[PDB]
Design a protein around this ligand. Sequence first.
Ligand code: MNR
Lengths: 216, 217, 341, 342
Amino acid sequence: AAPVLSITNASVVYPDGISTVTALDSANVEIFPGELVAIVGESGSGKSTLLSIAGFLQEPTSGTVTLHGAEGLDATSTRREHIGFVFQQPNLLGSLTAREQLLITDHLRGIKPRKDRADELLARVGLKGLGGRRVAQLSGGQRQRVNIARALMGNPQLLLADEPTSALDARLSKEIVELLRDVTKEFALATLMVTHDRSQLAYADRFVEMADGKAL
Amino acid sequence: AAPVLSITNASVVYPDGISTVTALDSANVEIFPGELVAIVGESGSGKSTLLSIAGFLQEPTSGTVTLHGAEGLDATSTRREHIGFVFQQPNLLGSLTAREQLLITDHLRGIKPRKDRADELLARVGLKGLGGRRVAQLSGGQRQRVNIARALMGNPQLLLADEPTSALDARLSKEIVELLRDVTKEFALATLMVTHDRSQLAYADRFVEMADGKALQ
Amino acid sequence: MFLGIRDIRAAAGRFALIASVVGLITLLIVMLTGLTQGLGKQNTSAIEALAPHSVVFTTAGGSSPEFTSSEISEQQAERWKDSTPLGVSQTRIESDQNANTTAVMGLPEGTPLPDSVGGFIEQGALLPAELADFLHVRAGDHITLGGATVTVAGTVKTENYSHTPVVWVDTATWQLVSHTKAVGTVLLLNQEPTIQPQDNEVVTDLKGAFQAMPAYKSERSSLLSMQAFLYIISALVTVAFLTVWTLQRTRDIAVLAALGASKRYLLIDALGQAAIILAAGVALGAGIGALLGWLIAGSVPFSLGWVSVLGPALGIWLLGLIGATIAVRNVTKVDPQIALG
Amino acid sequence: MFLGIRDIRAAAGRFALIASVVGLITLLIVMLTGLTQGLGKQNTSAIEALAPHSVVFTTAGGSSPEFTSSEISEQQAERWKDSTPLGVSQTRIESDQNANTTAVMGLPEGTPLPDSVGGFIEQGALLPAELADFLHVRAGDHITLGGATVTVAGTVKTENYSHTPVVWVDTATWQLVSHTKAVGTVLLLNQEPTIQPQDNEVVTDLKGAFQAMPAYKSERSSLLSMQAFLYIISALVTVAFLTVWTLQRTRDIAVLAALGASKRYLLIDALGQAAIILAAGVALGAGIGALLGWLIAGSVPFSLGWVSVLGPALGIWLLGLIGATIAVRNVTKVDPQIALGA
Ligand code: MNR
């Protein structure tokens, strides 16, 4: 009955070239365990900026972000132990195999890589047996599926998806959202999902719409 | 009544890893001078594949794509002489200045780069007296504005725009689509413009809706 | 270190070129190192074997001492107590069957020779074993030494002075062969000198005695400077390659950074990859180096030990690690937002 | 060259590092080149000056001829007619005030010396001027040469044999200094060899006559081998570095490719950039090379001309261009679709 993430009155100001630009403007968002929260809006409204704040990829220029259970930890240490990332591009490391793309997170976390866990999670994403495939043997959907699984390898409490259906057709993109929500429910994850395909709102528990860095 | 571009029954199948994928399935599109043809549809519907086809970046696995006035040329000679690319990301070369982003196209065409034209175009795109700026000193809207200007240096006949408002707030993205329409009309360009922002269709003379690689015609 | 090692597996091509460059440079350095120590022993092995504490010279016009111009008078020998005269000359040796030029060292009769050389100074000339075989001469046969007939007292091993083997003769014979009234060319002191030297005398250490040899300093110096540039070139090559190379990995490093990889982890990965590559190159260079050197040691003077192959090898590898940290410094500044692009 | 040259102007740092590596390697090569040629004349300059066509040696046990072991008996000298006896020895020279070791060459009395050296063979010893200054000996002063007191007949120019200056003497005096009844060690022939040699005799051309010098082959060979490795290292450094570098530009090359730039344009662009980088490095390295060498040539033997600095420099530059084409081969194989996405 406790929130995982709380973004209170946050704003971001990047030096856009010679001038400055307010990317995010007084964002207020709170996610609970088992919620799928979408963030809708046109391209450039501040969706990604809010996501990057939720992942401690940049401190807000004003306002506070609290991930409970990670109080007293620097920004980098917060990402490693509590947050799974589903980047817009699969961001698979070229020289590693499907299973190795889960294991390297175990390694950077300082634990003996778990092959069986990796195989179960790859199977949980419908890639059972494909642990040995390299990136060249993975389709667009398959890489995105390996990406989700990696976010799940460290068993985080915050799952951040950045338009993970942007290069997939209607069929494949539906599957990823169904998968994302199904995993969100099964493992009591708190998930932010940025999306521009409003056809996927039906699978979110709720959603925020954003314009000019202000949420509604 | 005479088209610049004729995409007729064009299909594209890339090797999606082990299998193949029909990324575009029998698309039929035609663009005449003075038209701003928008292509709407969700991300992953086949807009960019149709774009790439239109920009002679890759031949279709089946069906034919014709640009009139440039028949009998290989893929690369067609792009250098009759097409302008407004890439999704500005794709500015890092070591060049704003004006040099345009002049370098003139150099790769074999003509002594004309600085006057490079400044006139920079002004038309509203960047007068900024030709000296380097990319580090250009904001998001400005880089995109240089991109348009570079596409115009060669006086193209086909102007392709790949979601050129993807990283711009509502205010700036209006100016850019206004600039595209205004430049299209003023230079009698044939412009295809892929776009996900359905609020911008108003600026287009026509629009094509797309779903799963098929044009809803 | 996880990603770094498998980057090496999956792209062995790119690394083969750079490791080969490091391997060639280390091979050249190892072979140049062996050659400079070999030439140094070609010039100094005899004097070094005798192991004197100080060495007294004689000069003219207050110039720097030269083994080619120093003479010790009989009075000079009685002045320095606890000291023996060493005569050093080079001249032609001629037998009935063959001939050559050789170095002649003369010491007072009965002085024990170093175990490197063994035996003791006998009446007549003691020939190097290789030299006696060349001339078809046996112990007891007459030979022409510097225009004088001398009896071969026996065979000995070879030590060298100025790229020539040393023929050992009694102080009397050396005077006849070098046509001098002096008792020697220098004075060897094994104990610490307890006398203050004269206007024309000069005390020198064993090292400085080598610098009094004409070819030695002027050729070992040029060879040493060549080695210094080579070590420097290796470091710069690695730094140049590794700066450009680590820039190639920024994207993969950014993904790991976004995932939560610490700065230490990324720095260890990058440095680990360089260390493996540099290790490979240096091992192959020193391996091939020692082999070619051992294969050539018979034709060219080449000293081949463990320290002369692995000393420079470890030096180059450690220079690479220092260079690599310089080149990898920028792995901790990579903004993780590069992955969201 | 448009994109390539401006990459250099705006990011001179990274290119300075690699250009330094090319310059250092050339610097080392230029001085090693000059030093190897300097030592070659340090070993051969005197015999070259005499310029014989063929040279007849004497051997023992059918071994390779050696300057340290040859003597010609006077009848052997009469056999080969139209021949001149050359006596070559090294021994100690001692003046009233100083002494040193030098080479002594002996020829028959009255024979004119080569125009390289000039003068004539006189009874006595003709000294190099620089040696006479060191020894404080004037024309008419007595010197001890190999245990024999002879008067300095005059000064001449300086030639070298086995890292020693050559003192020129008559055949008779050389026999006294070298303690031999032979009339010489070799025979200089200015004409075509028309006499057949005995089993124990061996005729050689001027080049092969240098093999009979002890130090020459075994040290010039080692320097040449060192020089050969250096050229290979240069080629590999450029190939290694330039492959990774062109792989860095894939994105910018793709954009120019996407715009329509021909393959020749991108490849000419790339090699233009490489050629300029390589040119800068070699020029800067070879400049410092000639400078350091001229500054050192007084203390260490170093032969310095235009061909001995620019020959190797031009060779390296051509090696680099061949290497660069091997590295830039993939600039024309880049698909422009890379610009459409990230
Ligand atoms: C001014 C002094 C000298 C300089 C400078 C010099 C410069 C260099 C040099 C520079 C990079 C290298 C490599 C070098 C290497 C050699 N060198 Mn070196 N050398 N070097 C000599 C004086 C000098 N070298 C002398 C003297 C001999 C023997 C002469 C003779 O026997 O006829 C010799 C001979 C040799 C030999 C032959 C050894 C053998 O045959 O056993 C080698 C190898």
